[PDB]
Amino acid sequence: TVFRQENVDDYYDTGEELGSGQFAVVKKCREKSTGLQYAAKFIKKRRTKSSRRGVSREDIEREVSILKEIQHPNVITLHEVYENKTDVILILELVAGGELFDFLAEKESLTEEEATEFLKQILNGVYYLHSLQIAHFDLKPENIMLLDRNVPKPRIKIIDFGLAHKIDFGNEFKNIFGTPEFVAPEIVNYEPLGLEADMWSIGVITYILLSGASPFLGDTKQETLANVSAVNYEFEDEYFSNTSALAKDFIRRLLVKDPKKRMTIQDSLQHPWIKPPQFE
Ligand SMILES: c1cc(-c2cnnc(N3CCN(c4ccncc4)CC3)c2)ccn1
């Protein structure tokens, strides 16, 4: 599939660079014809067929196809796609309140009520994705953005679908590996992957929201990955002594090695607490 090949600068003016990962660049921009503001994500193309740098065309096209299908308040909207010799440029909805990662760094830890206000929105977005058989495969605080960080109950959107896949045969078995602290054991073990992997990541996120600490994090990537595979975590009393038993129950039912025994997204919404790359 080919994208718009006019110069993006003919249609948008860019401004501030926003925070991003090592591989893409994200800039605020403004569309000349409407004055509306967006975020432009520049994905570097592969320079040759057997190259390791840049993103393969197949991978870019998968991300664009998934973005085009999704429309939900808790997921980022794709507006347009441009391309040139070096980059594919996604014009995305602007989310200006920063990363949940940076919000958490300011608060240290969240109360159970504050955590559930965020978690409900994450679960609603993941329920939409899983209903479409889309696994995100990279859920973590850096991939969740706040619309406005200055309100008492900030609203959020899931971003960056660069690892997302449609799961139409129940599982995928290929080159899929996210960030070590957040990946499920089946990722660590290079096993077939399905929607269950996202549920594990939600368990990790929930643990971090309540404690400010990462449940499997070791001093090196290999230690973290070994900890994930062994389900080596505990609810440290220093962080969790005053946390409700139901919150611990929720996490415990997500941080389960066997994907078939892990809570699904539908289970998570009915749970009584809620119901109203890899190489150093
Ligand atoms: C504003 C921004 C964005 C946007 C789009 N794509 N990726 C984005 N980042 C967010 C930061 N980031 C990391 C990852 C690792 N370490 C530090 C930061 C993860 C990816 C932001 C979209 C709309 N409005």
Q: Give the residue from 3, 78, 85 showing the smallest Cα distance to 41.
A: 78
DSSP H stretches of helix in the chain: 57-69, 100-107, 112-131, 185-188, 196-211, 221-230, 237-240, 245-254, 265-270
Q: What are phi and psi of 10, to 5 degrees?
A: -70, -20
- Rounded to 5°, the CA angle 186-215-114 comes to 110
Residues 206 and 48: their CA atoms lie apart, in Å, by 41
Residues 259 and 108: their CA atoms lie apart, in Å, by 30
| Residue at 247: amino acid letter | A
Q: Which atom of ligand 1 is nearest to the CA of 94?
A: 24
Angle separating helix axes 112-131 and 196-211, nearest 10 degrees: 170
Would you say the CB of residue 21 lies under 6 angstroms from ligand 1? yes
Unique residue bearing structure tokens 């599939």: 1
Distance (Å) from CA 95 to ligand 1 centroid: 9
| Residue at 161: amino acid letter | F
Angle separating helix axes 196-211 and 245-254, nearest 10 degrees: 150
Residues 261 and 2: their CA atoms lie apart, in Å, by 42
- Distance, C-alpha 170 to centroid of its chain: 20
DSSP string, 153-178: S--EEE---TT-EE-SSS-B-SS---
Residues 181 and 64: their CA atoms lie apart, in Å, by 26
Would you say the CB of residue 26 lies under 6 angstroms from ligand 1? yes
3-state secondary structure of 114: helix
Would you say the CB of residue 164 lies under 6 angstroms from ligand 1? no
Contact between 157 and 76 (Cβ < 8 Å):
yes
Look at ligand 1, atom 14, and give the residue with the nearest C-alpha: 21
Cβ-Cβ contacts under 8 Å for 25 (sequence gap 6 or more): 17, 41, 42
Contact between 127 and 228 (Cβ < 8 Å):
no
Distance (Å) from CA 132 to ligand 1 centroid: 23
Instruction: Please say if 267 is a catalytic residue.
Output: no
Residues 142 and 262: their CA atoms lie apart, in Å, by 24
Cβ-Cβ contacts under 8 Å for 91 (sequence gap 6 or more): 8, 12, 29, 31, 38, 39, 40, 78, 79, 80, 81, 82
Contact between 24 and 39 (Cβ < 8 Å):
no
Write out the two tokens for 91: 């014009």
- Three-state SS string over 116-144 comes to HHHHHHHHHHHHHHHHCCEECCCCCHHHE
Cα within 13 Å of Cα(171), Cβ side = 12
Cβ-Cβ contacts under 8 Å for 210 (sequence gap 6 or more): 109, 110, 112, 115, 239, 240, 243, 247
Unique residue bearing structure tokens 């996210």: 178
Look at ligand 1, atom 15, and give the residue with the nearest C-alpha: 21
Look at ligand 1, atom 20, and give the residue with the nearest C-alpha: 20
Mutate to test the pocket of ligand 1, among 25, 36, 159 (most ligand atoms within 8 A of CB): 159
Contact between 258 and 244 (Cβ < 8 Å):
no
Experimental method, per PDB record: X-ray
Distance from the first to the final alpha carbon of the chain: 35
Cα separation values, 182 from 44, 136, 197, 201, 206, Å: 25, 12, 9, 5, 11
Look at ligand 1, atom 10, and give the residue with the nearest C-alpha: 20
Exactly one of 138, 148, 198, 267 is catalytic; name it.
138
Q: What are phi and psi of 15, to 5 degrees?
A: -135, -125
Domains and CATH numbers, the chain: 7-97 (3.30.200.20), 98-276 (1.10.510.10)
Q: CB-based burial of residue 267 (10 Å sphere; 0-12 exposed, 13-18 middle, 19+ buried)?
A: middle
